[PDB]
Amino acid sequence: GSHMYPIATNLKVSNNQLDSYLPIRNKNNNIDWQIVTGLVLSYAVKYKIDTYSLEQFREDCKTHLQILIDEPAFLSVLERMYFSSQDIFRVSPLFLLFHAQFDGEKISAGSTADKRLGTLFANLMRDFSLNNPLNFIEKEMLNKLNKKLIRLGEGPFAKEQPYLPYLVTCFQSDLAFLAEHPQYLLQELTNTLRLYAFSWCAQLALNLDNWQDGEPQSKSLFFILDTEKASSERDKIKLFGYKWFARQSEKLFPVLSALEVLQVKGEEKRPLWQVYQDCLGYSDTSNRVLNELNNYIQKFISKEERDLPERDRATNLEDAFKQLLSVAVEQFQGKKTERAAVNRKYINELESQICTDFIQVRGRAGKVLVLNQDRLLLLTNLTVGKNKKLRLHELLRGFEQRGFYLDNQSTQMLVAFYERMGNVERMSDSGDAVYVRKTV
Ligand code: NA
Numbered sequence: 001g002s003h004m005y006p007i008a009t010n011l012k013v014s015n016n017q018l019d020s021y022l023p024i025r026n027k028n029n030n031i032d033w034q035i036v037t038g039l040v041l042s043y044a045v046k047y048k049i050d051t052y053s054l055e056q057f058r059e060d061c062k063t064h065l066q067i068l069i070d071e072p073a074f075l076s077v078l079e080r081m082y083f084s085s086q087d088i089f090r091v092s093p094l095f096l097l098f099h100a101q102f103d104g105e106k107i108s109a110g111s112t113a114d115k116r117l118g119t120l121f122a123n124l125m126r127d128f129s130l131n132n133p134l135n136f137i138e139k140e141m142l143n144k145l146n147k148k149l150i151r152l153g154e155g156p157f158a159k160e161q162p163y164l165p166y167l168v169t170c171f172q173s174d175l176a177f178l179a180e181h182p183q184y185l186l187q188e189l190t191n192t193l194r195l196y197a198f199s200w201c202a203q204l205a206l207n208l209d210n211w212q213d214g215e216p217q218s219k220s221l222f223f224i225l226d227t228e229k230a231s232s233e234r235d236k237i238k239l240f241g242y243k244w245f246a247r248q249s250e251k252l253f254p255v256l257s258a259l260e261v262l263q264v265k266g267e268e269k270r271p272l273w274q275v276y277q278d279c280l281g282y283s284d285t286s287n288r289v290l291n292e293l294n295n296y297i298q299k300f301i302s303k304e305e306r307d308l309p310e311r312d313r314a315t316n317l318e319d320a321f322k323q324l325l326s327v328a329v330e331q332f333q334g335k336k337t338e339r340a341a342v343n344r345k346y347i348n349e350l351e352s353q354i355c356t357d358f359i360q361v362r363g364r365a366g367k368v369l370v371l372n373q374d375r376l377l378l379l380t381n382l383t384v385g386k387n388k389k390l391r392l393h394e395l396l397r398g399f400e401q402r403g404f405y406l407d408n409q410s411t412q413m414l415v416a417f418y419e420r421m422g423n424v425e426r427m428s429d430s431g432d433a434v435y436v437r438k439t440v
Contacts, residue, residue, distance in 0.1 A: 001280075001282065001283065002278060002281045002282050004278070004282070005264075005289075006278035006279045006282045006289060007262040007264065007278075007279065007289060008262055008265065009264070011292055011293070011295075013296060013300050013306075014261070016254075016257040016331075016339070016342070017257055017260060018253065018256045018257045019158075019260060020256070020269045021120075021160060021163055021204065021259075021269070022204070022252055022253070023113070023116040023117045023119070023120045023197060023201070023354070024113065024116070024201075024346070024350055024354060025346075026253075026342050026345040026346050026349065027349070028111065028112060028113060029352075029353045030111050031111065031113050031114060031117060032109070032110065032111065032114050033193070033194065034096075034190065035099055035100050035107075035110050035114045036114050036117045036121075036190075036193060037099060037100075037189055037190045037193060038096050038097055038099030038101075039110070039114065039117075039118040039121075040125075040193060041094070041096045041097060041130075041189070042097055042100050042152060042155070043122045043125055043152065043155055044125060044128070044129070044130040044175065045094065045130050045132060046151060046153075046155075047094075047149040047150065047151060047152055048097060048100065048150050048152050049097045049101060049102065049148060050101070050102050050104070050150050051101060051103050052098075052101075052148060053098065053101075054085065054088070054098040057098065057144075057148065058088065060144070061082075061141060062078060062079065064144050065078055065140070068140075081137075086186075088141075090182070090183065090186065091141055092142055092145070093133050093179075093182050093189070094142070094145060095145070096186075096189070097149070102150070105153075106156070115157070117193070118157055119157040119158055119160070120200065121171075121193065122155065123157070123160045123162055124167065124172070124200075125171070125172065125175070126159075126162070128175070131179070133179040133185060158269070159268045160268065160269040160270075161268055161274060162271075163204055163207075163216075163271040164200065164203050164204060164216060165215060165216075166217055166401060167196065167200055167203060167403070169401075170402050173382075174192060174196075174382045174385070175192075177382060177385045177386060178382075180386070181440065184440050191374065191378055192378060195379075197354055198355055199402055199403035199404070201252070201350060202245055203221070203403045205248040205252055206221060206244070206245070207219055207273075208251050208252070208255045208272070209248075209251075210273065211272040211325075212273075212276065212318065212321075213273065216273060218400055218401055218402075219403075220236075220240045220400075220405050221240065221241070221244065221403055221404070222236045222237050222240045222369065222405045222406070223241070223369045223370055223371045223404055223406065224237060224241075224368060224369070224370055224371070224410055225413050225414060226357075226370040226371065226372045226373065227413065228410065228413055230365060230368055234409060236405070236407045241369050242359065242368050242369045243366075245369060246367070249347055250343065250347065251329060252346060253343050254329045254331075254332055254343065255272070255325060255328060257328070258325060259271070259272045261296070276317075276321055279321075290314065290317055293314065293317075293320040293321075293323075294313040294320060297314075297320070297323050298313065300327050301327055306327070308327055308330050308331065357370070357372050358370060358371075373417075376414070377421070377439055379398075379399055379402065380418075380423070380438070381438050381439060381440050382402075383395055383402070384437060384438045385438075388437065389435045389437050390435070390437075391433040391434065391435060391436075392411075392415070392433065392435070392436055395436050396411065415434060418436060421439055422439075423438065424436050424437075
């Protein structure tokens with residue numbers, strides 16, 4: 001197939017590190033979600049604002065308008081019309097750019113976690129653009145704003161080939177839908193990002209082991225509505241819920257840091273399933289790749305290095321990768337070790353900063369994955385989207401595409417929730433299907 005050598009030309013047995021894909025590290029995960037939101041919009045429209053506050057824009061806008069008019073009554077009214085900043089934001093979500101202040105090419109106030117999340121979403125937005133999301137006063141305000149907007153250029157984020165292409169499609173549809181509804185964009189863009197950040201990390205964890213199968217698809221992760229007791233014995237929740245997520249989450253840092261070893265310098269990063277595929281299609285008569293991996297693995301498990309059980313070299317590429325991923329995990333076994341502590345911090349950070357209110361306690365049943373009512377409404381609106389109406393099964397398939405699965409019982413409770421919310425065709429007529437519409 002190819003003749004591009006598929007992995008790093010020099011494979012160092014080094015300290016575990018990742019520079020890609022996961023948006024959290026073992027510490028320093030203080031996230032400014034409004035900055036992240038500003039960064040996302042900036043990358044969507046290819047503009048930024050440089051060291052210039054919304055406070056100052058507001059003042060400059062008043063001033064700008066009284067240069068054009070200067071009627072004492074008029075000033076007093078615009079003062080009142082735009083005293084509340086929500087009324088500036090409502091004119092255009094371009095105003096969210098003020099949250100992501102740049103200083104030259106640098107993100108002025110972001111933590112490095114903000115930049116990491118910015119990077120996740122920029123790689124869900126490859127080859128994606130928003131057309132800028134109006135009465136006569138508002139148009140003058142956007143005219144003043146356009147004078148402040150600086151072109152983004154390539155921007156500050158790293159390029160990473162999409163690990164989960166199915167979330168890309170969904171994310172881009174959802175951003176496009178929000179852009180058509182600017183008032184709803186303001187209410188929900190940020191929550192949409194928290195939702196995607198979680199689902200992306202969960203779906204990643206659940207697809208790590210599927211590196212043999214090429215391009216991944218949505219994996220069954222089951223959530224209850226936060227309103228449910230979860231007292232009866234539900235198989236899907238037990239087998240494919242929190243405990244499945246938690247088991248697979250334990251491999252994020254191990255597997256992704258190993259993948260980091262293979263990544264070719266001076267090239268866009270790519271996911272493990274792409275790297276494997278590239279290794280299979282590379283025609284090397286001399287088995288260069290297989291030999292390099294075996295050398296690395298054998299050096300990895302050596303006593304001077306990680307000190308792991310001896311094993312015969314891999315005779316093929318499939319078995320070489322499995323070996324790489326075993327040892328990648330094996331080094332974190334034994335609760336006592338220092339590396340097992342690092343992996344634990346990864347889990348706690350993930351659960352604290354990314355999984356907020358996706359997890360709850362349910363008595364003796366321990367932790368449980370939940371969808372709270374806000375997220376449920378957000379999903380409903382995103383999924384119905386540009387449609388007037390979806391059949392219930394159509395809706396659930398949308399939810400599933402985005403990483404959210406529901407058993408039959410949760411689906412009953414969902415429909416009941418929609419009756420109260422008044423966005424379902426259910427008991428009030430006799431129809432061919434259950435139809436769900438947007439609440440917005
Ligand atoms: Na009915």
